Amino acid sequence: DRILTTRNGHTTSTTQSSVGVTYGYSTQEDHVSGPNTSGLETRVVQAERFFKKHLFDWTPDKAFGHLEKLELPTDHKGVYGFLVDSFAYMRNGWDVEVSAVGNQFNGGCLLVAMVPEWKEFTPREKYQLTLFPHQFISPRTNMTAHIVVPYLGVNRYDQYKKHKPWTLVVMVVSPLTTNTVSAGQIKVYANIAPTHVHVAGELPSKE
Amino acid sequence: TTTTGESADPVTTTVENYGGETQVQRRQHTDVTFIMDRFVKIQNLNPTHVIDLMQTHQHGLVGALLRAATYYFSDLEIVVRHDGNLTWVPNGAPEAALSNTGNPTAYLKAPFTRLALPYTAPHRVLATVYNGTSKAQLPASFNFGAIQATTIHELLVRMKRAELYCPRPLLAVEVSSQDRHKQKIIAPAK
Amino acid sequence: GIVPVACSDGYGGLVTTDPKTADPVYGMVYNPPRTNYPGRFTNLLDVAEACPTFLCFDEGKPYVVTRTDEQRLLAKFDVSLAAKHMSNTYLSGIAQYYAQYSGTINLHFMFTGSTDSKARYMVAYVPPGVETPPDTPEKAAHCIHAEWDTGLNSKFTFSIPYVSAADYAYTASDVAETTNVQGWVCIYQITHGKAEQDTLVVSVSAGKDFELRLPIDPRSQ
Amino acid sequence: GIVPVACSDGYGGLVTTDPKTADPVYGMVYNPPRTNYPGRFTNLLDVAEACPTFLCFDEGKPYVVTRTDEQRLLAKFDVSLAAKHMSNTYLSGIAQYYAQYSGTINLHFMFTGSTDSKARYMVAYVPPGVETPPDTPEKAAHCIHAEWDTGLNSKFTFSIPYVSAADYAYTASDVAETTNVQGWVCIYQITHGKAEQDTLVVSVSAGKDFELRLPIDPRSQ
Amino acid sequence: GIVPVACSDGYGGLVTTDPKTADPVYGMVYNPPRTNYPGRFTNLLDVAEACPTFLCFDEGKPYVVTRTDEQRLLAKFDVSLAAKHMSNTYLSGIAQYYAQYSGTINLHFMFTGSTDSKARYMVAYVPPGVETPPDTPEKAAHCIHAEWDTGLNSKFTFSIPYVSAADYAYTASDVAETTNVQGWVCIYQITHGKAEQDTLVVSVSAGKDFELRLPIDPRSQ
Amino acid sequence: SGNTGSIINNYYMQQYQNSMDTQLNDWFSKLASSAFSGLFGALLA
Amino acid sequence: SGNTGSIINNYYMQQYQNSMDTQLNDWFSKLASSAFSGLFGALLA
Amino acid sequence: SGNTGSIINNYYMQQYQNSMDTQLNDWFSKLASSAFSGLFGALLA
């Protein structure tokens, strides 16, 4: 059963080349109603759905250690994005799908990981990125990686305009190889959905 | 053992696969609370000093293991060698408070002062890295209070009942040798 | 032989807040009785909850007033125990001696106009996240808020909620923080009827879950 | 009279790893709750078993590759936590802080070639006792070893056994030891089919009975 | 108040043989197992009883021999753990570290002659009380003694009894004592048959009630 | 009682450690607990 | 708990010795214990 | 055990005071106890 369909709201994603789902650090969420919001937080399901982002083009010239990152949340022009501008505090986890579509004649390997409290890693530290929740993408085996993570941080609710707890990271483990029958490059995309979205502290309007 | 590497599911094979036998292991020394529970030096000192565990040496036993975690929690013990009386104030206090006796103040008693202090941050846990601003450096609120004396000569900190969350890279010395890092291991004289 | 002990280095010095007691020297003293002496308080916060004290508005008045009947922002103050407006309150007097707090802070509004004067007011809690506080009731309506009019009951009480990222907030405010960290409280007049010289007295008390922790001695001595 | 005690010489000094606790001075502090905070680890070896980290081969690559389809020794490294090849691993990062270890160390091999590339590999554990490591699969066959080919499952894991005279081995390596004390691991390519530019990624994790003991603080500070 | 104590003068100094233990500093160390390791001894005297060691006779020989078949005193030595003849024995090696002893000391005689050589010997314990030891078997017969001849069994063992005024005797011998305080042991040859070059090997072990007490450290260091 | 944290009894008798009270009540606790809460009048929630 | 080895109770109350936790779980232990072992597929031993 | 004479337990846990033995016997005592005694052969006392 390499076939998987994921649903988030009124959006679905179906992949026929998956190696399952990796859950990071936990399988459920910490308590979303703590003392810091005095019972004024509310959930917004209309924001729990997939949004898209191109990460990069995986080409043969990129070597081991080449790293691409996406700090979350990122600019969002839909419901979720509106919440970031209209409420002072928020919390949510992430349902992350990364795809790298070439063909089975390509070779190589990408590491896909979710990193809490991103800091630029030194070359030597890249050898240990597997300490973070991750999966690999190798054209001979899969085109999709899927990671699910909960919200975390020193604070139970956050101000995303000031702090991004999670960072999606894609790193080249072994360079893309090409044949006469393979793809020449692979475009890597992310399909992300925020999960268990809660907001607190409605802000005034700007007009 | 043969498995699907891409899924990143942990796989722990054993010597039994080729007829060996797995032995008994005793891991108390790699227990987190235990390993962090020992005094380490702070080093960069001033007569007014804010206790920040990130001032431990990054390659020191405690400093390195601490940086190999993202979030942590602990109470603290400190040993301070100072001239004059030593005053401590909790996380959040105005620096000005360090001058008053109503705050925990330890009167000089040679050779130094050892105290047990509770965690006082306003956060449920602290972090060793923080991806953002609070107004890279860490937020000002990540501390265990501050101490002041006429002169602070030495400061040792000890993490009590430590909890660590979310592992991060931990590095050994890089090797130039091409085979092994070699060093002088202690051996009997003569 | 006798018991061997290790006199331990780093222990034994006097600490001004230590949890031990001194040796006594003058025994058997019986005190005059003080059974049922009135007015006792065993927790500072019992007093802080029960006795609201006045806020301070421009010119040292415990009230706001407006001459025009149009909608106006009557007052705006930082949600801080170190705010100018709270500087003469008992709650701030107590709070200065603790490093952190959390919980509800209650505002009280008492209209003192004559029978023939009426008004309608609005109070809003504006969390951190905006450059400047809203200048109109319309923009502020999108925040947590309450509106009320004057009548037989002269007093209205509103809870300023504790909404923050951390579980506790600092009682003092740092020189580096330009815009207030816990947000603002904005008091508006929606409109009034013949209330030109009539005032709204504002006071503050501690809420049911208001809490102060970590005693400190900060004042210059 | 009172209790007589002997204040004992040689006792009482501060020892940085002592098993006693300091006297407290600031009581009754209640912490914000951190119930079920995710990602906790209570033993370093739980992390070391579950998260393999990459080895380092000539040029700083976490993999080996070969252009010829003949049989070749692809890599040879010392069975030492101080080996060049293990220098960027988490297992070695942890091991530097302990003087001794015993137990199983696990190697993981992940083939990243395209569907049309195949290979057959061999890994052998060569104990101490020979001058130089075997350069061919044939000579190495007489050692403990495993052979595998590439297919649907991309990963193969092999346990490097703890075989030694003493019950524990040192984690560090001495300047005097020329040839490695715990032996070698040799990775060979038996042959391949159209796998000229395809690689084998190698990582390492702690085995079930892997153990570290005797904490030390060795780095230059 | 706290507990009042009297720090007592004259107590507390380190004594190299004290019965107390030091404070620990490095816990939780588990040792490699050494279950049933062979060759253990828990008391020095178990070894001393079971393993006789050789005496030393003129010229450093562990035996006596005589060329004439007449009756002769073959050897005479002081019943002292400091005797020249006992100087290379394990019993004396142990005894030097104790000030006193009491109890039985056992002598062993092993004849090493050829089948065609025979002899008859006598051993006598001569207590203190006479100027010089008896030079003939006839004079010595009046003492506690044993006589034996050679045959199929090559070894004869004889107990030197502890007979003294005090309950313990000193292991060392003083410069002032000219004649030995515990007496002598005299070994005679009654006669022999064709035993001119054949020897009698002599060794010594501790007896069942042999005891050493009061440890001392006497050697020049 | 208040800022004392020894698990062990005091070595000295109470008659010596402290003065002793004689006989012949928390007003602010009662005052605070008596406070009105909620709403006055009808609610349309 | 961790690097403390007195057989005897602490002289001070726990409320003074340490901070106290409030309420409103070892992930890596579970992760490690969940690891696959042995062989995948048929064995001819 | 050997040259220790306190009637009172040690203040520190055994796991700290000493190293701890693991498992997977006095030879000279047995050797000595096995020694022959008395006489070999007939006695005319």
Side-chain angles (χ1 to χ4, degrees):
Chain A
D1 188 43
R2 303 281 310 303
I3 183 180
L4 170 76
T5 291
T6 299
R7 217 247 294 178
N8 279 298
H10 300 144
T11 68
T12 69
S13 189
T14 298
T15 179
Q16 298 193 63
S17 59
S18 105
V19 290
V21 177
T22 285
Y23 285 85
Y25 304 141
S26 186
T27 41
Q28 13 112 183
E29 298 254 338
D30 56 27
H31 203 313
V32 311
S33 299
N36 68 304
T37 55
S38 300
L40 300 166
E41 72 288 337
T42 56
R43 182 164 178 189
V44 189
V45 305
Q46 291 80 6
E48 308 174 349
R49 61 202 318 294
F50 285 119
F51 67 89
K52 285 128 167 73
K53 203 82 177 40
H54 171 263
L55 299 180
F56 78 115
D57 292 338
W58 186 19
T59 54
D61 58 290
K62 293 173 172 68
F64 160 65
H66 178 89
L67 187 156
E68 217 71 50
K69 63 159 190 61
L70 180 68
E71 303 187 19
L72 300 172
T74 193
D75 205 71
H76 188 293
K77 315 281 197 176
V79 177
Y80 182 86
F82 171 79
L83 301 181
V84 178
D85 285 313
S86 311
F87 290 82
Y89 301 102
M90 291 185 62
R91 57 173 286 143
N92 66 90
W94 304 100
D95 188 350
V96 181
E97 238 197 7
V98 171
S99 74
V101 179
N103 73 12
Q104 62 277 53
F105 294 101
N106 281 111
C109 181
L110 290 177
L111 169 70
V112 179
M114 286 296 282
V115 180
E117 308 305 339
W118 162 266
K119 167 205 82 97
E120 196 199 289
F121 295 106
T122 71
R124 291 184 72 208
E125 298 175 313
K126 291 175 181 177
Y127 287 80
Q128 295 179 33
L129 288 195
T130 46
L131 285 176
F132 300 109
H134 70 281
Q135 284 196 333
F136 297 93
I137 293 180
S138 294
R140 66 178 295 99
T141 298
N142 60 321
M143 298 196 289
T144 292
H146 198 145
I147 304 169
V148 176
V149 297
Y151 170 85
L152 38 59
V154 303
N155 295 322
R156 202 183 320 285
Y157 276 66
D158 209 350
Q159 305 178 78
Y160 295 141
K161 279 170 171 188
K162 289 165 73 182
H163 172 256
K164 310 293 187 72
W166 285 107
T167 295
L168 171 56
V169 171
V170 179
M171 179 184 88
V172 172
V173 173
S174 195
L176 184 63
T177 61
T178 65
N179 277 316
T180 25
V181 296
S182 82
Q185 57 163 40
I186 295 185
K187 301 182 93 69
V188 184
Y189 286 82
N191 195 28
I192 306 159
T195 65
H196 302 293
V197 180
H198 292 73
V199 300
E202 40 267 59
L203 299 177
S205 63
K206 299 152 185 185
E207 303 194 314
Chain B
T1 317
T2 289
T3 58
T4 292
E6 299 82 356
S7 67
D9 284 334
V11 44
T12 299
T13 185
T14 63
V15 293
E16 274 79 359
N17 276 19
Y18 50 87
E21 176 167 347
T22 294
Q23 308 295 299
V24 162
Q25 94 288 335
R26 283 170 247 260
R27 294 177 174 180
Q28 307 72 31
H29 286 355
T30 46
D31 173 84
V32 166
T33 300
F34 174 86
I35 194 64
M36 306 304 276
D37 198 352
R38 63 206 61 240
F39 286 107
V40 292
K41 271 201 167 207
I42 282 306
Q43 222 129 57
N44 282 340
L45 311 172
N46 297 285
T48 294
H49 187 85
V50 174
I51 306 171
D52 169 12
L53 296 186
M54 289 308 290
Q55 282 171 307
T56 45
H57 194 288
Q58 92 203 85
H59 296 319
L61 169 61
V62 170
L65 288 180
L66 179 65
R67 293 171 170 73
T70 305
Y71 307 104
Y72 66 94
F73 165 89
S74 76
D75 278 328
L76 209 71
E77 272 191 31
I78 61 177
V79 173
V80 190
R81 191 143 61 64
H82 55 91
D83 286 335
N85 295 331
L86 179 76
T87 292
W88 172 84
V89 293
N91 179 302
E95 189 168 302
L98 286 163
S99 298
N100 304 311
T101 287
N103 302 294
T105 297
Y107 278 60
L108 184 45
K109 183 191 210 293
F112 42 60
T113 305
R114 180 180 177 165
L115 301 172
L117 295 171
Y119 177 94
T120 59
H123 312 291
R124 53 188 181 171
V125 298
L126 292 182
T128 59
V129 190
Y130 185 80
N131 189 37
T133 318
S134 217
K135 331 218 70 298
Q137 330 259 334
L138 292 177
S141 58
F142 289 13
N143 68 69
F144 280 82
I147 53 173
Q148 184 180 91
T150 300
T151 301
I152 297 184
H153 305 291
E154 191 172 0
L155 169 60
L156 305 177
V157 293
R158 177 169 184 169
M159 295 179 73
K160 302 299 300 183
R161 71 190 194 86
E163 295 174 5
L164 298 185
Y165 305 81
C166 308
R168 308 183 77 82
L170 176 58
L171 292 164
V173 303
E174 48 182 326
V175 186
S176 143
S177 293
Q178 199 60 54
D179 60 326
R180 248 177 302 150
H181 171 53
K182 299 200 266 298
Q183 50 187 324
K184 199 198 184 323
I185 293 187
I186 60 164
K190 278 167 189 171
Chain C
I2 67 190
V3 173
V5 303
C7 321
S8 300
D9 279 355
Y11 293 77
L14 162 73
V15 179
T16 57
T17 52
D18 76 13
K20 57 179 132 79
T21 55
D23 286 346
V25 303
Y26 203 65
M28 319 255 84
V29 176
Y30 288 85
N31 304 312
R34 59 194 189 273
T35 312
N36 300 331
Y37 192 86
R40 186 160 178 204
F41 59 100
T42 62
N43 196 288
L44 301 177
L45 289 193
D46 285 339
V47 184
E49 267 186 46
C51 311
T53 54
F54 303 125
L55 258 62
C56 186
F57 298 101
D58 68 301
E59 260 182 43
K61 299 308 173 190
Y63 55 76
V64 296
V65 47
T66 186
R67 310 214 67 174
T68 177
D69 73 337
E70 57 195 341
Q71 72 179 195
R72 291 255 146 291
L73 164 66
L74 296 179
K76 158 275 161 207
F77 56 91
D78 295 339
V79 174
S80 178
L81 289 150
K84 197 228 72 174
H85 310 66
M86 301 265 294
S87 69
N88 296 332
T89 65
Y90 179 76
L91 190 65
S92 291
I94 278 173
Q96 78 189 308
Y97 293 116
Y98 295 89
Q100 293 167 34
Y101 84 93
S102 57
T104 314
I105 291 172
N106 288 344
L107 287 180
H108 306 253
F109 304 91
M110 188 168 71
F111 185 65
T112 63
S114 46
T115 297
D116 63 302
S117 60
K118 311 266 178 80
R120 188 158 184 92
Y121 300 105
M122 180 184 148
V123 62
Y125 167 59
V126 189
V130 283
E131 280 282 292
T132 57
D135 57 334
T136 66
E138 291 77 6
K139 299 180 197 167
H142 303 294
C143 297
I144 286 166
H145 76 264
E147 203 182 277
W148 75 100
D149 63 12
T150 60
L152 229 56
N153 287 171
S154 63
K155 178 161 162 163
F156 181 72
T157 310
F158 173 80
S159 290
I160 298 164
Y162 180 83
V163 182
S164 196
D167 280 1
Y168 285 95
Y170 291 158
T171 55
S173 167
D174 185 86
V175 289
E177 42 179 289
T178 50
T179 137
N180 189 55
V181 164
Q182 286 333 304
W184 305 286
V185 167
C186 291
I187 303 169
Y188 307 86
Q189 167 180 272
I190 298 306
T191 186
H192 72 51
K194 211 70 189 74
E196 304 85 26
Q197 46 174 186
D198 297 301
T199 77
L200 188 67
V201 175
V202 190
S203 56
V204 64
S205 64
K208 256 149 84 174
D209 54 5
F210 182 78
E211 166 190 339
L212 288 168
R213 68 170 197 149
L214 313 170
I216 52 173
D217 189 14
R219 301 289 293 281
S220 188
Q221 301 165 59
Chain D
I2 67 190
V3 173
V5 303
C7 321
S8 300
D9 279 355
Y11 293 77
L14 162 73
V15 179
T16 57
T17 52
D18 76 13
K20 57 179 132 79
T21 55
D23 286 346
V25 303
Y26 203 65
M28 319 255 84
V29 176
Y30 288 85
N31 304 312
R34 59 194 189 273
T35 312
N36 301 331
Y37 192 86
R40 186 160 178 204
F41 59 100
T42 62
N43 196 288
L44 301 177
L45 289 193
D46 285 339
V47 184
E49 267 186 46
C51 311
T53 54
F54 303 125
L55 258 62
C56 186
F57 298 101
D58 68 301
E59 260 182 43
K61 299 308 173 190
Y63 55 76
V64 296
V65 47
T66 186
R67 310 214 67 174
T68 177
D69 73 337
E70 57 195 341
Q71 72 179 195
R72 291 255 146 291
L73 164 66
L74 296 179
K76 158 275 161 207
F77 56 91
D78 295 339
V79 174
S80 178
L81 289 150
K84 197 228 72 174
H85 310 66
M86 301 265 294
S87 69
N88 296 332
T89 65
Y90 179 76
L91 190 65
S92 291
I94 278 173
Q96 78 189 308
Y97 293 116
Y98 295 89
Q100 293 167 34
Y101 84 93
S102 57
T104 314
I105 291 172
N106 288 344
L107 287 180
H108 306 253
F109 304 91
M110 188 168 71
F111 185 65
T112 63
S114 46
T115 297
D116 63 302
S117 60
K118 311 266 178 80
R120 188 158 184 92
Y121 300 105
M122 180 184 148
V123 62
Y125 167 59
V126 189
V130 283
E131 280 282 292
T132 57
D135 57 334
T136 66
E138 291 77 6
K139 299 180 197 167
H142 303 294
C143 297
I144 286 166
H145 76 264
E147 203 182 277
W148 75 100
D149 63 12
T150 60
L152 229 56
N153 287 171
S154 63
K155 178 161 162 163
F156 181 72
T157 310
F158 173 80
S159 290
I160 298 164
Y162 180 83
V163 182
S164 196
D167 280 1
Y168 285 95
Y170 291 158
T171 55
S173 167
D174 185 86
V175 289
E177 42 179 289
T178 50
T179 137
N180 189 55
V181 164
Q182 286 333 304
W184 305 286
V185 167
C186 291
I187 303 169
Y188 307 86
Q189 167 180 272
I190 298 306
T191 186
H192 72 51
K194 211 70 189 74
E196 304 85 26
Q197 46 174 186
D198 297 301
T199 77
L200 188 67
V201 175
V202 190
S203 56
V204 64
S205 64
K208 256 149 84 174
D209 54 5
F210 182 78
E211 166 190 339
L212 288 168
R213 68 170 197 149
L214 313 170
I216 52 173
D217 189 14
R219 301 289 293 281
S220 188
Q221 301 165 59
Chain E
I2 67 190
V3 173
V5 303
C7 321
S8 300
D9 279 355
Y11 293 77
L14 162 73
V15 179
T16 57
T17 52
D18 76 13
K20 57 179 132 79
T21 55
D23 286 346
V25 303
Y26 203 65
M28 319 255 84
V29 176
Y30 288 85
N31 304 312
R34 59 194 189 273
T35 312
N36 301 331
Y37 192 86
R40 186 160 178 204
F41 59 100
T42 62
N43 196 288
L44 301 177
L45 289 193
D46 285 339
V47 184
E49 267 186 46
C51 311
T53 54
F54 303 125
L55 258 62
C56 186
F57 298 101
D58 68 301
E59 260 182 43
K61 299 308 173 190
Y63 55 76
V64 296
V65 47
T66 186
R67 310 214 67 174
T68 177
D69 73 337
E70 57 195 341
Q71 72 179 195
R72 291 255 146 291
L73 164 66
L74 296 179
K76 158 275 161 207
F77 56 91
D78 295 339
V79 174
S80 178
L81 289 150
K84 197 228 72 174
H85 310 66
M86 301 265 294
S87 69
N88 296 332
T89 65
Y90 179 76
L91 190 65
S92 291
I94 278 173
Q96 78 189 308
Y97 293 116
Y98 295 89
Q100 293 167 34
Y101 84 93
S102 57
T104 314
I105 291 172
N106 288 344
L107 287 180
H108 306 253
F109 304 91
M110 188 169 71
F111 185 65
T112 63
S114 46
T115 297
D116 63 302
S117 60
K118 311 266 178 80
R120 188 158 184 92
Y121 300 104
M122 180 184 148
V123 62
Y125 167 59
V126 189
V130 283
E131 280 282 292
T132 57
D135 57 334
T136 66
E138 291 77 6
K139 299 180 197 167
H142 303 294
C143 297
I144 286 166
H145 76 264
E147 203 182 277
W148 75 100
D149 63 12
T150 60
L152 229 56
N153 287 171
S154 63
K155 178 161 162 163
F156 181 72
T157 310
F158 173 80
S159 290
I160 298 164
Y162 180 83
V163 182
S164 196
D167 280 1
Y168 285 95
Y170 291 158
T171 55
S173 167
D174 185 86
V175 289
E177 42 179 289
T178 50
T179 137
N180 189 55
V181 164
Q182 286 333 304
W184 305 286
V185 167
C186 291
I187 303 169
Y188 307 86
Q189 167 180 272
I190 298 306
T191 186
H192 72 51
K194 211 70 189 74
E196 304 85 26
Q197 46 174 186
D198 297 301
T199 77
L200 188 67
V201 175
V202 190
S203 56
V204 64
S205 64
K208 256 149 84 174
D209 54 5
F210 182 78
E211 166 190 339
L212 288 168
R213 68 170 197 149
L214 313 170
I216 52 173
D217 189 14
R219 301 289 293 281
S220 188
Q221 301 165 59
Chain F
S1 84
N3 199 22
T4 286
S6 311
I7 275 171
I8 294 307
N9 281 311
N10 169 34
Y11 180 86
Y12 296 96
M13 277 156 34
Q14 222 218 314
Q15 303 93 275
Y16 277 82
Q17 193 63 51
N18 306 93
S19 60
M20 288 179 299
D21 299 329
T22 65
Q23 303 310 324
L24 256 199
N25 187 230
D26 190 334
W27 176 257
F28 284 92
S29 196
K30 298 182 186 187
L31 199 65
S33 295
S34 84
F36 295 101
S37 267
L39 294 45
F40 183 129
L43 164 68
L44 172 74
Chain G
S1 84
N3 199 22
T4 286
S6 311
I7 275 171
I8 294 307
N9 281 311
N10 169 34
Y11 180 86
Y12 296 96
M13 277 156 34
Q14 222 218 314
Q15 303 93 275
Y16 277 82
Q17 193 63 51
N18 306 93
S19 60
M20 288 179 299
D21 299 329
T22 65
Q23 303 310 324
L24 256 199
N25 187 230
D26 190 334
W27 176 257
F28 284 92
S29 196
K30 298 182 186 187
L31 199 65
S33 295
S34 84
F36 295 101
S37 267
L39 294 45
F40 183 129
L43 164 68
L44 172 74
Chain H
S1 84
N3 199 22
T4 286
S6 311
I7 275 171
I8 294 307
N9 281 311
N10 169 34
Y11 180 86
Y12 296 96
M13 277 156 34
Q14 222 218 314
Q15 303 93 275
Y16 277 82
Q17 193 63 51
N18 306 93
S19 60
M20 288 179 299
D21 299 329
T22 65
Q23 303 310 324
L24 256 199
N25 187 230
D26 190 334
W27 176 257
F28 284 92
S29 196
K30 298 182 186 187
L31 199 65
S33 295
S34 84
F36 295 101
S37 267
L39 294 45
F40 183 129
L43 164 68
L44 172 74

